[PDB]
Amino acid sequence: MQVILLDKVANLGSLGDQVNVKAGYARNFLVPQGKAVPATKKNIEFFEARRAELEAKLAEVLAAANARAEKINALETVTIASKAGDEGKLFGSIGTRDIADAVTAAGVEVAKSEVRLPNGVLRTTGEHEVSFQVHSEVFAKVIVNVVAE
RNA sequence: UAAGGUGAUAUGAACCGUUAUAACCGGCGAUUUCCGAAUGGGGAAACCCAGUGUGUUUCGACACACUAUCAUUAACUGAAUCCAUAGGUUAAUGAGGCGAACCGGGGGAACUGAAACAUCUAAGUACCCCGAGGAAAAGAAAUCAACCGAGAUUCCCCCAG
RNA sequence: AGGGUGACAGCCCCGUACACAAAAAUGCACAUGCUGUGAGCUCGAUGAGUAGGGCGGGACACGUGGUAUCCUGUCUGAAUA
RNA sequence: UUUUGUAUAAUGGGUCAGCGACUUAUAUUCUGUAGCAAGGUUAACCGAAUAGGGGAGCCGAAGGGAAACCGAGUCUUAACUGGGCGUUAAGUUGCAGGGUAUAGACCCGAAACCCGGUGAUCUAGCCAUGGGCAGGUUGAAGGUUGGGUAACACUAACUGGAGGACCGAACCGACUAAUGUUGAAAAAUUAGCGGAUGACUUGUGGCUGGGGGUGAAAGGCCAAUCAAACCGGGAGAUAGCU
RNA sequence: GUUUAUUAAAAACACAGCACUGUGCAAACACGAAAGUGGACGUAUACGGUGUGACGCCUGCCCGGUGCCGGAAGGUUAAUU
RNA sequence: UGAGCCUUGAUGUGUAGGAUAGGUGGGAGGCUUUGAAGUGUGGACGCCAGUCUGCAUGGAGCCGACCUUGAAAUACCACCCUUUAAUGUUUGAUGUUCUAACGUUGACCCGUAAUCCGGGUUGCGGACAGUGUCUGGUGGGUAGUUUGACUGGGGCGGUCU
RNA sequence: GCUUGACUGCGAGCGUGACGGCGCGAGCAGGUGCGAAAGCAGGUCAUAGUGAUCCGGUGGUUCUGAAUGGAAGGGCCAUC
Ligand SMILES: [Mg+2]
Ligand SMILES: [Mg+2]
Ligand SMILES: [Mg+2]
Ligand SMILES: [Mg+2]
Ligand SMILES: [Mg+2]
Ligand SMILES: [Mg+2]
Ligand SMILES: [Mg+2]
Ligand SMILES: [Mg+2]
Ligand SMILES: [Mg+2]
Ligand SMILES: [Mg+2]
Ligand SMILES: [Mg+2]
Ligand SMILES: [Mg+2]
Ligand SMILES: [Mg+2]
Ligand SMILES: [Mg+2]
Ligand SMILES: [Mg+2]
Ligand SMILES: [Mg+2]
Ligand SMILES: [Mg+2]
Ligand SMILES: [Mg+2]
Ligand SMILES: [Mg+2]
Ligand SMILES: [Mg+2]
Ligand SMILES: [Mg+2]
Ligand SMILES: [Mg+2]
Ligand SMILES: [Mg+2]
Ligand SMILES: [Mg+2]
Ligand SMILES: [Mg+2]
Ligand SMILES: [Mg+2]
Ligand SMILES: [Mg+2]
Ligand SMILES: [Mg+2]
Ligand SMILES: [Mg+2]
Ligand SMILES: [Mg+2]
Ligand SMILES: [Mg+2]
Ligand SMILES: [Mg+2]
Ligand SMILES: [Mg+2]
Ligand SMILES: [Mg+2]
Ligand SMILES: [Mg+2]
Ligand SMILES: [Mg+2]
Ligand SMILES: [Mg+2]
Ligand SMILES: [Mg+2]
Ligand SMILES: [Mg+2]
Ligand SMILES: [Mg+2]
First to last CA, chain A: 98
- CATH, domain range A69-148: 3.10.430.100
Q: What are the φ and ψ backbone dihedral angles of A54, each rounded to 5 degrees?
A: -70, -15
Q: What is the DSSP track for chain A?
A: -EEEESS-BTTTBSSS--EE--HHHIIIIITTTTSEEE--SSHHHHTSHHHHHHHHTSHHHHHHTTSSSSSSSS-----------TT----S--SSS---STT---SS-B-SS-----S----SS-------BSSSSS-----------
Task: Give, in Å, how far the C1' of F136 lies from the CA of A149.
Answer: 132
A124 touches strand F (CB under 7 A): no
d(CA A123, CA A79): 17
d(CA A25, CA A1): 9
Task: Give, in Å, how far the C1' of B84 lies from the CA of A13.
Answer: 34
Nucleotide nearest residue A33, measured CA to C1': F100
A107 touches strand F (CB under 7 A): no
The resolution in angstroms reads 2.2
d(CA A17, CA A40): 14
d(CA A21, CA A1): 5
